[PDB]
Amino acid sequence: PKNVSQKDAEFERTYVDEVNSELVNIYTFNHTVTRNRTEGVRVSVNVLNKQKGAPLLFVVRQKEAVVSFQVPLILRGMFQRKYLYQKVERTLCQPPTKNESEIQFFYVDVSTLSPVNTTYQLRVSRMDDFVLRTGEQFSFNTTAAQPQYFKYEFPEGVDSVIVKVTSNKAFPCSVISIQDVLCPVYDLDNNVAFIGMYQTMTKKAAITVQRKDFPSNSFYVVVVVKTEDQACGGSLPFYPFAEDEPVDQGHRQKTLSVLVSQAVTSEAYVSGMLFCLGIFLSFYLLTVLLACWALPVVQLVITYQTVVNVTGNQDICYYNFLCAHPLGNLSAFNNILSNLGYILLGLLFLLIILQREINHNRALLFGLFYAMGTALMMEGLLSACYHVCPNYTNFQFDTSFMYMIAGLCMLKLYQAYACLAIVIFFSVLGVVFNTAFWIVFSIIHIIATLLLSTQLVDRMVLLVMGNVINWSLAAYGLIMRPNDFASYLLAIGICNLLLYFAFYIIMKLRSGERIKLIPLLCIVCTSVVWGFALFFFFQGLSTWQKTPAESREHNRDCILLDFFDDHDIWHFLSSIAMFGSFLVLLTL
Amino acid sequence: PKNVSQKDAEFERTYVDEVNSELVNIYTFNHTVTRNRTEGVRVSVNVLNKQKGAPLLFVVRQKEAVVSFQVPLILRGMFQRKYLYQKVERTLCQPPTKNESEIQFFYVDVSTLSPVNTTYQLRVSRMDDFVLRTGEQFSFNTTAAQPQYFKYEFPEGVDSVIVKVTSNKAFPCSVISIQDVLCPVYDLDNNVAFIGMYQTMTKKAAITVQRKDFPSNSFYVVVVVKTEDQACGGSLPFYPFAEDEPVDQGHRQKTLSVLVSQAVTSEAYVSGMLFCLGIFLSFYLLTVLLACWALPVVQLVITYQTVVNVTGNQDICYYNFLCAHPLGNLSAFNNILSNLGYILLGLLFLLIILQREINHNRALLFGLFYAMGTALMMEGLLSACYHVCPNYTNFQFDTSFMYMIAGLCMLKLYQAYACLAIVIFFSVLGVVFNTAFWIVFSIIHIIATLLLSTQLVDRMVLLVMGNVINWSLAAYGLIMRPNDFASYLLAIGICNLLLYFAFYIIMKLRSGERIKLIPLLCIVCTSVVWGFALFFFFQGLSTWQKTPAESREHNRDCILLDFFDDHDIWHFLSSIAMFGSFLVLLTL
Ligand SMILES: *[C@@H]1O[C@H](CO)[C@@H](O[C@@H]2O[C@H](CO)[C@@H](O)[C@H](O)[C@H]2NC(C)=O)[C@H](O)[C@H]1NC(C)=O
Ligand SMILES: *[C@@H]1O[C@H](CO)[C@@H](O[C@@H]2O[C@H](CO)[C@@H](O)[C@H](O)[C@H]2NC(C)=O)[C@H](O)[C@H]1NC(C)=O
Ligand SMILES: *[C@@H]1O[C@H](CO)[C@@H](O[C@@H]2O[C@H](CO)[C@@H](O)[C@H](O)[C@H]2NC(C)=O)[C@H](O)[C@H]1NC(C)=O
Ligand SMILES: *[C@@H]1O[C@H](CO)[C@@H](O[C@@H]2O[C@H](CO)[C@@H](O)[C@H](O)[C@H]2NC(C)=O)[C@H](O)[C@H]1NC(C)=O
Ligand SMILES: *[C@@H]1O[C@H](CO)[C@@H](O)[C@H](O)[C@H]1NC(C)=O
Ligand SMILES: *[C@@H]1O[C@H](CO)[C@@H](O)[C@H](O)[C@H]1NC(C)=O
Ligand SMILES: *[C@@H]1O[C@H](CO)[C@@H](O)[C@H](O)[C@H]1NC(C)=O
Ligand SMILES: *[C@@H]1O[C@H](CO)[C@@H](O)[C@H](O)[C@H]1NC(C)=O
Ligand SMILES: *[C@@H]1O[C@H](CO)[C@@H](O)[C@H](O)[C@H]1NC(C)=O
Ligand SMILES: *[C@@H]1O[C@H](CO)[C@@H](O)[C@H](O)[C@H]1NC(C)=O
Ligand SMILES: *[C@@H]1O[C@H](CO)[C@@H](O)[C@H](O)[C@H]1NC(C)=O
Ligand SMILES: *[C@@H]1O[C@H](CO)[C@@H](O)[C@H](O)[C@H]1NC(C)=O
């Protein structure tokens, strides 16, 4: 019959042995565990012979679960590709023990059916750093045939943590998943998307884990390295189309550093809420003291957020995963809260103009400004709902109405619904989507600027300088193209808005009309505020042009009060900038 | 050491044997295969002892692949549920053989680490009906621990086929997937969504398979039965929340009948195109003879269609999978083509009114009708783009503008943009979403009907009868509620449109004005056409209220020319009905 050989081998020892169609090798391993200190066990095997027909079959048997594979392991690409790996390392799943100290046995068996010998080296390692300590960085190497996973044990008094994993070289692609502590652990390429919360990453990833979702007060962080970098956004290699010939990928590896850090406590929310309310209520107090002296987008966003919450797939929404603090079912509560200033400040504009109008009516004994105020209020709803799940499908509304508001300003400089609709449809056309665009957009910009100047000695030279600087900005955008058209469009919009604001001031200076102190302070304050507003807008925390794995590279931590990142500062300063721009028009 | 026993057993024989922590059993099986006739091998094992701690570990070793499991198998639910199964059956994957006749060996090994005996019965069956013959129905039983799969070999001269699988009892839920013929086959619960094209189903499913995507001229149909019916849309059982106690599900089984049938050939496409063009060009010929005598929805739909095409997940779009014939990258080309009548017939309306207007101007020597014609043309784009991937996220536009067009008709009966916008926003509000709705909707309907009658002896009695029948329809909708509000809204809209059409005719009859022959024929023809149009609309081929697995139950085959289903007939007759309704207004 078949010859079976047995050995009671030990940890930390590479055994080199031969196997053919006749030999079956059994290795028994004893392992010591305790309830307080749990440590993982890793099986690592190499094959030093090249066989394409009959591989070696390895099985690892435990008390509860069994695992099995074949080496040289063959993984699958995209177009019926076959990648060959010779080294495979896997970490066994050990269910939590009941008794204080129980000795666990596990067996490793080797077999094959090839008619010729084959040499393999096998080693079992007692993985020392199985448990992840809070606030400590651990670096490890993973390839496509060597998935890894570490157990993190929620400390006493921690509500939730964040797992941050970073890498230096962007490629190869990888998947980082969080799973509950229950055998078995899905660390293979095909079942890694079954349960848990997973993110595909190339350089950086961050996953927020809560204790309410894990009753056992622990979880597993599983890292897997893909074979083809198409998911991360790379360019697939143009290897010959071999249907039944496996091609080796050479040396592909990923070095990753993982750190689990406690998240913000409840104070961060209270300080962030009090700070936001304190800033905007100060304008209400100041105005009282002075007086004394989209639906379909909402449905899509809600559906996508529910899909993210229930599926565990975190590749749908483009959050700022490094600084995004959840509350309830909302995954990034600070991003929603940052738009509260739109509501309060737009409503303050309605108060101030209502006071002005009633004063004028009493003395005697405005619709466009109301439209701008209502647009500002609508920002606080539409942009807030967008940030519940940012994506390329529903991105236009985040900045579109903003351009629309600018139009109203321009209209009050020219002195309605038709021009607003034209602006909305042009924004939709432009954001539907590219060197041909890079050229046609510049041509259309030049033509539109010339026509706008024509419709409007000092004036002709002034418009010539405006067109010259506009063409300079167009060439700037065309040459390097460091950012998307979405940022560029808002940039040219605000620059042209301040540009026309300055032209009106210059026309006033050429006349004998003297600007009062209040409008002068208003224009200066609005301009300086818009400065930092554009500064923070040009950061680009998350970009939706590329794959989400790439979009994760530009995440940055919380900057203000440990609650708000740069985009929230953009919201905060954009609200003030529009308030000042409107007050410039009102008091002009 | 460990005691290993060996036996060279045979097919079609149940072996009952005992295993404990000391015994390891090996069974060698010889198998005969040929290139022309490939037949599958199934391993079936039962355990007759109840053990919760230490299960039996079974491994099946082949020349190329290894498989392993443990019984009593434990599957996972939704809220850390554990279901226990005692019978497991799996079909081995056999790579295609090179030589004409090669004998394949495979081994089955049994082990366990429990300190007490355990009895198991194991049997290997040479599955006779492994290959699926075209146009033949095969019935089989699958449970959650007994996934099955059959090989379908594309015949000579068949471009593409459709796999139709049906069941009688709606539960339990299941997943039906199509995969290429390459070891291994992902028939487990966790990896069934890795590759291939898969649909979750409860009663019916249909998957279209093409030869260009399968270079080996064959594929695998894999059926898996889930554990919890939440995905299919059922109600989860309220078993006690046992974290570490597995609960048996009793006897859960699914009987399925599968049939692979060649798809429509190239002629059906040509006959369908010539039929569609022939119908609409006949109206152009008739008019010449008589004369001689949304963007964001488009982006979302495109993204979802690409996601379906590349992911293999067919649960995103709610097609009529029984009658949906693809072409190029489009998955249901007939559904898109059925809207061509909107374009042609709306454009014919523009021709006829342009002729009428130029005749009037020449004799002397209309904007609202143009708006309706343009709305009809816009249907042919918006509804066509919707049908590329129907879903609850983009459904509003499929029927929304429909009511909007009706409004224009009503307006020309009352004799614009404001009422149209009000109708659009009310449709959005109503379709955002429910007994509270079932009552409030009826109340609002009654109030709106009364107000509309008030704004408009014979008249008062006439409006009283109209309100009475409208309340009758409201009670009809409220009592049984067999369909969604989406069908009901269009139903009441068209009924009220014909109702006002008839009221105007009655007002004409009460006067001495005699209706000319042409308008009388027009009203009669429009009414009879709208009859069958509503008849075909009330069918409900696909409903998006429930889960897609349930939405698949109401699929029906092609009815007209083997290319068009009922919804295409609804499109065809709705186009004619609006053309007749418009011609009624023009010649009134
Ligand atoms: C686990 O098993 C190993 C394998 O037998 C044990 O290692 C042996 O221990 C004895 C006791 O001192 C030595 O005499 C042998 O030389 C060891 N084997 C080898 C290959 O060196 C080990 O002791 C076991 N663990 C425990 C806790 O008993
Ligand atoms: C991860 O892999 C890298 C690359 O093999 C390792 O870096 C090498 O480490 C060895 C041992 O210290 C050095 O001799 C080489 O010079 C290093 N090469 C490079 C390019 O850095 C790294 O040590 C591995 N990390 C771990 C934790 O094993
Ligand atoms: C496959 O293996 C089985 C198991 O040995 C073979 O069955 C035996 O065949 C011989 C030849 O006639 C009989 O004398 C034995 O009694 C059979 N075994 C049993 C348990 O009945 C079978 O012949 C093999 N297949 C082929 C094609 O040789
Ligand atoms: C699928 O399972 C059903 C239910 O067990 C089988 O139906 C039974 O078949 C046996 C054998 O003919 C009869 O004695 C029972 O009366 C049947 N019960 C019912 C409720 O129909 C059915 O035969 C199985 N199908 C297959 C292909 O095995
Ligand atoms: C079977 O193989 C084992 C493994 O090397 C060996 O120790 C044993 O002597 C062999 N038995 C026979 C009868 O050759
Ligand atoms: C394990 O830790 C618990 C408290 O964390 C302690 O009570 C117990 O004594 C520890 N076990 C041992 C063996 O020290
Ligand atoms: C703990 O050990 C005792 C004796 O060593 C044994 O009887 C008991 O079954 C063990 N606990 C478990 C959960 O097996
Ligand atoms: C494998 O190696 C051993 C020792 O070198 C040798 O005796 C044996 O014949 C080899 N196997 C085969 C199939 O030749
Ligand atoms: C080992 O177990 C096998 C299986 O029953 C048996 O045939 C054999 O006699 C046993 N050997 C010893 C030494 O007990
Ligand atoms: C298998 O089929 C091919 C053609 O389909 C035929 O040429 C060949 O002879 C067949 N093989 C045998 C063993 O008959
Ligand atoms: C086919 O059989 C011959 C002799 O029986 C053998 O030499 C050859 O290797 C076999 N083909 C394959 C692909 O193994
Ligand atoms: C299993 O059954 C055999 C035969 O009845 C018996 O000899 C053996 O002792 C049993 N196993 C144990 C662990 O008692």
Author numbering:
A (entry chain B), B (entry chain A): 25 to 317, 461 to 532, 547 to 596, 609 to 626, 630 to 652, 686 to 817
Task: Reproduce text from the manuscript describing this model.
Human SIDT1 and SIDT2 are closely related members of the SID-1 transmembrane family, and have been implicated in various biological processes such as glucose and lipid metabolism, innate immunity, and tumorigenesis. Here, we present the cryo-electron microscopy (cryo-EM) structures of human SIDT1 and SIDT2. Both structures reveal an overall architecture of a dimeric arrangement composed of an extracellular domain (ECD) rich in β-strands and a transmembrane domain (TMD) with 11 passes, highlighting the remarkable structural congruence. Importantly, the ECDs of SIDT1 and SIDT2 bind synthetic plant-derived miRNA only under acidic conditions.
